[PDB]
Design a protein around this ligand. Structure first.
Ligand SMILES: Nc1ncnc2c1nc(Br)n2[C@H]1CCCCO1
Ligand SMILES: Nc1ncnc2c1nc(Br)n2[C@H]1CCCCO1
Ligand SMILES: Nc1ncnc2c1nc(Br)n2[C@H]1CCCCO1
Ligand SMILES: Nc1ncnc2c1nc(Br)n2[C@H]1CCCCO1
Lengths: 261, 261, 261, 261
């Protein structure tokens, strides 16, 4: 079938990349970076992130695999030494597939823009103070004054979400999580402080009070958006499909990354 | 049908309790506190908690209603002024039902004990230091040294869970959440620090290292358990069934309780 | 003696400003905004901040007073209704003086720049990742990877410092406090996590690892600094001198601002 | 001069204890555990704690030394391998002394009891809910509802204080710090949340609202106190005197204990 391979650019990953292509020629595997059915990234979670944010118009037709040339990753959870056995089982077939939830981000102003995020989407101010009204399913929930907000996917709870005091969520739970950044609370302003986890179909909307320019990030990407009228956070209908062979539990992957490997 | 009414004991709740029974006689409603199909509690979330921890052997045959004589509650979310309209719609029928997830707690030693918790179950030490090994689905995750741990239901995230830095979870998500208490971290010990959210079927087990006596709480109840070999936390198969009429979203109930009513 | 008055620019503060000048003509008080011995700001803590960051070359020759036309402030702790009694006691003399500690900030590259901060000084990255080595009195303490760091004066603990989980410090304690921003911790990186309070003469130095451009703030001011070789945080030798009449304890000022006024 | 040596009881510390006494006979050093001028503890910070809480009626007449047979300690900051050089420099004289601040704890009811704490003093409830009014210098500051409170000395910030989110304080700062335990905040109750650092002479008083029984700890010691009318926290006039030779900065001791040794 059709496949392609992403690389981190260094000498370690490119050499490991060419050794899978050479072994791929021994099987019935055609190389195609325009219409691959298997995306394989080699490097780190950042390399996997880019490989995702490149074929995100056909997420329901690709099974991704991630290999970590450096430390262990949460998406690149395959050691380089197990590359040969990967190609053998990858080129055969009849592997199990795994899907993780995603986060739709809608921006309304000059039309309206839409984004998919594997990790999280964060919102800050253009330079001055960050003030937004937080509407949850058409209901004004709070008025947030601080550095910004961050809505995270389940598999993205281990990333920026974790730095902000949020909870680590098992990615089999179709949900999204909102976390606060240096929220100022006093006799005047009042934020919930706690992280909030929203199920499917739950819509969280951010609306400006004064400044209508917000520096918005979608995973690694980050753009300053001008004349913003609304931001829509919502669990996406699309899911990223993983290819799996051996079992690597998310909780074990959490153990190795933070406790001890 | 059969019903019963719990009261907080004060003069406000007992008077409000007798006014529903008197109006109940105007309809086809038999009073029965042994086999009720409708449990109505009057007082606070604590009064609702006791009413739950009393008919918890027939949770799949009762629809609970909670009225708050004081401030708003997360389970007692009906004002006393709306009691008359409750009895009218309660005694008719054809109301919508709502189910919330629960948390099974297994204690192994002298047999083995099992508990259902509407809010949370917490574990502390008998007096000395609290040290436990944390096993997640047969896999040793961490060794916790601190004051204790707390596993919370979704609707219980607003209670003790919230005090420990955990996230607020929408109760339509069948999951449980673990939070840490004053975890000491150094060059030696290492806890995850973050809260952990486990889906259905996920089993979290606590195992002792030295002290085998743990002061364990199940909602309001709290007992010192001697010679403990294991504690099993797990999302319960049973759900508590609520009776609903008007819509009171959990997020609005969170807004009124902490931001402003 | 010589005095001047700062105003917030709105109609409320300018009217209140002219009423003190008119009453000042009834006493022996000369208006002078070049060499005042008494600086009076009218508006909020932001207005007081600007009045400080304007006469900061003669801090040991001025006693500041702050009036709050809006809500109570931590430096503007005088109600507008008590303006007349202020001018009477201000124009007499024989008032008590009060000094608060300050934070010296040294930036080394194109010479070397020095800054005084009444509240705090914060450091972020120019755009990419924020990585710095933290040296405490010539000793490498930690390598910080996150959003940035914030060193706060005692009276500035109530401001950004408080948003980052830091402690509130009584301003009679000559010390400075460092707080972390969304510090990422894993098997690799390791930050202390806790806030650190340094006494007088203690020198905290930040040194770059890769990126040598840091967006640095000094109270309200904020500049991107290029080709930075070192940042020096240190309790300043200069103190801001306050004029006092009635006693307004910092702890009461903390109570009114966050608990209830 | 007169000295005595405390030991942890295990075989490693007692052997190391007898080797200093044997070498002590080679100099002019008399052994005396009733009136020692030098207290030497061997084991851990817990062993040092007990050695402090034993001669605390003559703190201004003793210089303590701590040796760690296990991991490094914050008071037992001398490796066992450097024991011989200790006895030589200890038995000579003309060493530098170092004093750390202490925390006075007054309990009023049956008289009134007073306690000195090297690390911290904590207060919990007798079993039910913990509710206290917090008075700061005769001024009601807040009403705390939660698990308890903890007032820490500067050198005790590294201990329980650190587990509760408090700041690490350099022990040259004569101050005390208060931290909260699982404080519940809602539309009703309101705690400051932040840790509070009080200078010398500042008096913090806890007063009961309903329950007058509080489980109170003073370092390792912990007693349930009945019919309590007030608890008084206050920086003590007495200081613990350390004997020093080489310089071991508190910040380096913090680095080795939590970052990496
Ligand atoms: N989901 C994730 N969990 C933990 N880390 C993640 C992550 N996704 C990415 Br990209 N990362 C990495 C990128 C480089 C190092 C920092 O975070
Ligand atoms: N789920 C919940 N969320 C918030 N509060 C809850 C709660 N359950 C109970 Br009981 N409570 C109340 C009891 C009395 C006041 C403290 O908490
Ligand atoms: N020290 C301080 N403590 C609390 N607030 C402070 C402050 N200094 C300033 Br400026 N502020 C205000 C400015 C406007 C509102 C936000 O913070
Ligand atoms: N001041 C302190 N800082 C850090 N640890 C301290 C401490 N005092 C004591 Br005792 N300890 C130890 C005792 C055994 C291990 C836990 O804490």
């Amino acid at each position: 079938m059709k496949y392609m391979i992403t690389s981190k650019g260094d000498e370690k990953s490119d050499l490991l990349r060419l050794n899978m292509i050479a072994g791929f020629g021994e099987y019935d595997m055609e190389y195609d970076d325009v219409e691959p059915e298997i995306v394989i990234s080699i490097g780190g979670d950042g390399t996997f992130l880019s490989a995702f944010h490149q074929y995100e118009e056909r997420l329901d037709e690709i099974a991704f695999i991630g290999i970590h040339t450096g430390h262990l990753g949460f998406y690149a959870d395959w050691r380089p030494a197990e590359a040969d056995k990967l190609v053998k089982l990858l080129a055969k077939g009849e592997y199990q597939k795994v899907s993780y939830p995603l986060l739709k981000t809608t921006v309304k102003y000059k039309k309206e823009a839409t984004y998919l995020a594997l990790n999280e989407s964060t919102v800050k101010s253009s330079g001055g103070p960050f003030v937004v009204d937080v509407v949850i399913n058409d209901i004004h929930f709070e008025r947030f004054r601080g550095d910004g907000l961050c809505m995270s996917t389940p598999s993205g709870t281990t990333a920026y979400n974790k730095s902000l005091g949020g909870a680590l969520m098992h990615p089999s739970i179709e949900a999204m999580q909102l976390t606060e950044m240096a929220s100022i609370n006093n006799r005047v302003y009042r934020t919930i402080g706690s992280p909030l986890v929203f199920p499917k179909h739950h819509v969280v909307s951010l609306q400006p009070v004064n400044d209508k320019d917000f520096q918005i990030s979608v995973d690694h990407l980050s753009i300053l958006h001008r004349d913003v009228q609304e931001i829509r956070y919502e669990v996406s209908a699309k899911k990223i499909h993983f290819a799996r062979f051996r079992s690597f539990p998310f909780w074990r992957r959490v153990h190795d990354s933070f406790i001890e490997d």
